[PDB]
Amino acid sequence: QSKYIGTGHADTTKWEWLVNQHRDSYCSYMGHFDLLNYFAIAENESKARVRFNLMEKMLQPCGPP
Amino acid sequence: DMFLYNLTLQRATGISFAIHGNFSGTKQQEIVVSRGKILELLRPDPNTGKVHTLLTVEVFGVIRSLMAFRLTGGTKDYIVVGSDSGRIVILEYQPSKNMFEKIHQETFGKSGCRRIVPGQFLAVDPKGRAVMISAIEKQKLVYILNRDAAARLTISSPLEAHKANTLVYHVVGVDVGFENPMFACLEMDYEEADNDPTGEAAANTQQTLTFYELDLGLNHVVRKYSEPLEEHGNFLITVPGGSDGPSGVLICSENYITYKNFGDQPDIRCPIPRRRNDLDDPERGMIFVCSATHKTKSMFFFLAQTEQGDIFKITLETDEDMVTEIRLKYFDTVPVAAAMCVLKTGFLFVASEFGNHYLYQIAHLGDDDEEPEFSSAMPLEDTFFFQPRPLKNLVLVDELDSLSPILFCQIADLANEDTPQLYVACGRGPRSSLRVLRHGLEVSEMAVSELPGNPNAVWTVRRHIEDEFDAYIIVSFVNATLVLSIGETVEEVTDSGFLGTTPTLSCSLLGDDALVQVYPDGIRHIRADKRVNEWKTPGKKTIVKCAVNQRQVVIALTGGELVYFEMDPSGQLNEYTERKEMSADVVCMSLANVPPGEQRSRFLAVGLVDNTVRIISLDPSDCLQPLSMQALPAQPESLCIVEMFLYLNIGLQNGVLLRTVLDPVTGDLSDTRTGSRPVKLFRVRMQGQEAVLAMSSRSWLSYSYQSRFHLTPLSYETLEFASGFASEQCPEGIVAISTNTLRILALEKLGAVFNQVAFPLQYTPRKFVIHPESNNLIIIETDHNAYTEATKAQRKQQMAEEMVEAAGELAAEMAAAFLNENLPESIFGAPKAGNGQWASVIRVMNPIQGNTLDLVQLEQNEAAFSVAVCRFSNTGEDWYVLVGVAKDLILNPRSVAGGFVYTYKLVNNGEKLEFLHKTPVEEVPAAIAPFQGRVLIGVGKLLRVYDLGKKKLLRKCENKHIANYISGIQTIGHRVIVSDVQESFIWVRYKRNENQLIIFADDTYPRWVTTASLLDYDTVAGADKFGNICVVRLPPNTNDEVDSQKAEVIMNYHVGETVLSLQKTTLIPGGSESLVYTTLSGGIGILVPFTSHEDHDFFQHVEMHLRSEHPPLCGRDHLSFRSYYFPVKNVIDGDLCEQFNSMEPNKQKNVSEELDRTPPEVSKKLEDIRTRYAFDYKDD
């Protein structure tokens, strides 16, 4: 379980948990087509640019610890 | 108990992926596209230039990547599919069976669009020796592809290429000349960024272009090369290598493109050219959205499209084995595409990311003209500039109608027809539209010409019997008839025809070349040799009805007096020596056409005011003698004898139509109600055979197909008359007149589908309401990152003023061309700017035509998200239009300055909006609903009861215990259902005594609701942002006085496409209620209740069997797919069940015999659902 990214333990901070679920969420946006469609419709941006911003968000989705 | 049954009616039309190649194994090139949940194989014809859908298959999974490859010496391209399964699948299309054969399927991970499980990215070696499937992070796998002695493709074991804490922007196979396979990818390591509380490690962390090599001799993968990039890139391009061109990749980046082959190749960059005088905010960057690649034995080039839809032709100059410069050139402009395919024989396929798709023909390669050609070696510091021009290198050859994205939908009978239409608000920005959907036969409008007065009839007459095409079109009005010669210019004629001033009852070609006109005052015969024989009506009578033929003319006069004329072989007409009277007056007649061998038809159908039809012989043995009569449930309106056997068709005054069999006597019959309109009958030529066209509220077509009849309606408006047509312009069409309009139509397509008529809009629509009196539409069109027309005008003017400032005096001329021309925003894209800017417009549009009745351009930073039309209890019967608007909405991070609620008077029975007042509010109100003479408005998490005041909307009640945010609200006569954005539905009661909104129920699960509908007083059906659908029900014995009721969920089902409209409605007259939903990918589905538990067990066992004998194509588990977020509860997948007809015959025999049935029985029981709830046009 330690080798599986996203797994947690007792000494897991809240920042680690929410950066894990943030990256998971962004990857799911990349995956499910109609989700990326809804997002690309909300903010008037093409699918490519929305995926690009979602990839730039992967470095630090929330902020430094 | 409530068990449901899902079925798709219009499959998803938007395209997520598109590849091209010789998938059929021939010289023909096909295009495999992924619509998300559906894999589709299309074949564009190099002759007619149309795209035909060869195959369409539901994969019951999420397609995330699509690639095609070919082994060395191969003649047929395979299909690698990266899905949401933990499996990779290689497929091969089979033309003899028209199905994708799953050649290979290898498992490696868990299901779902996971973060570290491969499937998102897919890149193949350009020689076909290896394929690489990779996730967004960490894990990367490579399979080796090699065929055996039987020439069948074989796969190897997976080779690991993992790299912890690494993100992959894109993967691309590098074209090496049969060297070790190379996979280049963009990576980004976040291990440093995750351990730096200052955030400085986040910055300066640039992505690395890394080259992975597959050591075929050592059978392992090593991170061979890696170099950081200057700025972040979005995707790569395979540069052809080996014998054709130099190896390498093209990294696309914000405002730049970089050829960066590894070794001693220096990095070559070129800035992205920008359009001259961009109305966009200059602070915004510019990237490419997609790229196509064409490889020739001679040359090669690329096509890269920008965010504005600018297609550039990128060429590389080369010396020795190294590249010298990147030569870009402005090719053309098309809508923003998700994929492009450059096929041989000069064709470009443009699958737009939203809206309709396009197929162009390449006329010129883009060179030999005098347009500027940019190079990387050109010095500048400032970017290149070019002029966007109309299409001059491409020509639009075909356009595929795509409904994606569907944002609102109302299924109602706004038109005069009987079957309800689907009024769909859908589109993308400027290319948005309101499209009306009728399920029937596609009608190709060949011509339309408006007619004066009210025409009542029309016929089409040849000049000679041997003429392959008609010669005249005759139109009968109230006091006149008009003749048109269908020559090259379809012009009005007068001399060749004679006819008369009076109305005409019939026009036919009697002789080989003789014309016969029947009018109420008599009969005119016109010989080819211009000699006219005139027949006056005996006495003061007039001709009521008529029935003509190739050699017979029967007329019915007032008092029901029949007069019979027969033509002798010499050519003249001879009146019979007897006139028969009927029991009552005659209202309609029909006379079958003469067979080619015989010289006269025998049977004559006559309809009477007696509400009876009678068959009368016309042979001289028993001329004008009764043969067989028959009573009818109502007075007849039209009759038509037709062959396929002999059938008499009877259309009554009410909407009923009857088919009867007859020969010496009338036989048994079958009937159906079409009603609302009197049924008329016309002879039409369809597919080289005789078919009958019956006209009521809709125009239905009855035609025999392999001794099996069909009665399919036309996806078209009401029509008043019609006759068969045939010219060189339209070899087999129909001339039809409607109220004050003449139309030349054609029925090219034989299959019945959802056909559309599109009304363009300006901005992206959010919602539209139905005005009960006017039957018109009030649509709100809101768009992010947008200028309003006024603001766009000021920035264009201001840009001209800045433009004049340069010393130069051609600035005024450049400003003449620049100001004069506002480029069409539909094709060249709409100017976009600002992260906080918006653009919203209210529109009053008539759904019958395409005209906009009223237009209300809102302010610059105002964004409307809700709208409603209702009355108020304090005022009279005056209609008011409330529009919820938001002020300075900034999303990511969410921050709102304010909100407004406009109130409008809607005067002139729903044709103009008059400003009343504009009530401000603190948070955005995204929900407005009429409720008990007042209006419920949801501002933020606060649900307020609002009443109308003469100055502003007075707040009468408020409830603020709502969790997060109000997305929608619908109310039954007493209760209030609100849709929390994240916390499912909530159940609120309004106490009338104190104006108090008491929350009396909520949901046990959180649901990201998108839309919903109240199925009854207790249950609600809701959609999901993640593409789910549920039905939640209150406990049976409940009252709104109690509190904290947990609403139980009685239905869960993952559709796989995000649903944005649920509506309980009946699709056809006589059918049952179905729950029709629309989706964001341009698809229409239905949920259908079961009538008995026996059917539930039956279809359930069908589901279980097909889950194992016909597993989903891309390795996904069907039960897990439909249980994506919530386990399935009381839904049967009918899309999987209907694949029973696609299985092998032995599997059909096994599954059927396990149910103690036969395959045809199972198929018929599956068709029964569509017959009861959807569209079935079989006519016994």
Curated annotation (Swiss-Prot), chain A:
GO terms for biological process: mRNA splicing, via spliceosome; positive regulation of DNA-templated transcription; regulation of DNA repair; regulation of RNA splicing; U2-type prespliceosome assembly. The keyword Phosphoprotein applies. It is found in: Nucleus. Residues 1-62 are annotated as: Interaction with SF3B1 and SF3B3. GO terms for molecular function: RNA binding; splicing factor binding. Signal peptide: none annotated. The record marks G6 as: Interaction with RNA. The keyword Nucleus applies. Its main location: nucleus. Keywords: Acetylation, mRNA processing, mRNA splicing, Nucleus, Phosphoprotein, RNA-binding, Spliceosome. GO terms for cellular component: nucleoplasm; nucleus; precatalytic spliceosome; SAGA complex; spliceosomal complex; U12-type spliceosomal complex; U2 snRNP; U2-type precatalytic spliceosome. The modification N6-acetyllysine is found at K3. Component of the 17S U2 SnRNP complex, a ribonucleoprotein complex that contains small nuclear RNA (snRNA) U2 and a number of specific proteins. Part of the SF3B subcomplex of the 17S U2 SnRNP complex. SF3B associates with the splicing subcomplex SF3A and a 12S RNA unit to form the U2 small nuclear ribonucleoproteins complex (U2 snRNP). Within the SF3B subcomplex, interacts directly with SF3B1 (via HEAT domain) and SF3B3. Component of the minor spliceosome, which splices U12-type introns. Component of the 17S U2 SnRNP complex of the spliceosome, a large ribonucleoprotein complex that removes introns from transcribed pre-mRNAs. The 17S U2 SnRNP complex (1) directly participates in early spliceosome assembly and (2) mediates recognition of the intron branch site during pre-mRNA splicing by promoting the selection of the pre-mRNA branch-site adenosine, the nucleophile for the first step of splicing. Belongs to the SF3B5 family. This is Splicing factor 3B subunit 5. It comes from Homo sapiens. The gene is SF3B5.
UniProtKB/Swiss-Prot annotation, chain B:
The modification Phosphothreonine is found at T1158. Residues 1058-1081 are annotated as: Interaction with SF3B5. One of its GO terms (biological process) is positive regulation of DNA-templated transcription. GO terms for molecular function: protein-containing complex binding; U2 snRNA binding. The keyword Plastid does not apply. Keywords: mRNA processing, mRNA splicing, Nucleus, Phosphoprotein, Spliceosome. The record marks N964, K1129 as: Interaction with SF3B1. The modification Phosphoserine is found at S157. Residues 1004-1025 are annotated as: Interaction with SF3B1. Gene3D superfamilies: 1.10.150.910, YVTN repeat-like/Quinoprotein amine dehydrogenase (2.130.10.10). It is found in: Nucleus. The keyword Nucleus applies. The record marks G285, E307, E353, R428, N892 as: Interaction with SF3B5. Residues 194-232, 766-784 are annotated as: Interaction with SF3B1 and SF3B5. Pfam families: Beta-prop_RSE1_1st, Beta-prop_RSE1_2nd, CPSF_A. The core of the protein consists of three beta-propeller domains. Component of the 17S U2 SnRNP complex of the spliceosome, a large ribonucleoprotein complex that removes introns from transcribed pre-mRNAs. The 17S U2 SnRNP complex (1) directly participates in early spliceosome assembly and (2) mediates recognition of the intron branch site during pre-mRNA splicing by promoting the selection of the pre-mRNA branch-site adenosine, the nucleophile for the first step of splicing. This is Splicing factor 3B subunit 3. The gene is SF3B3.
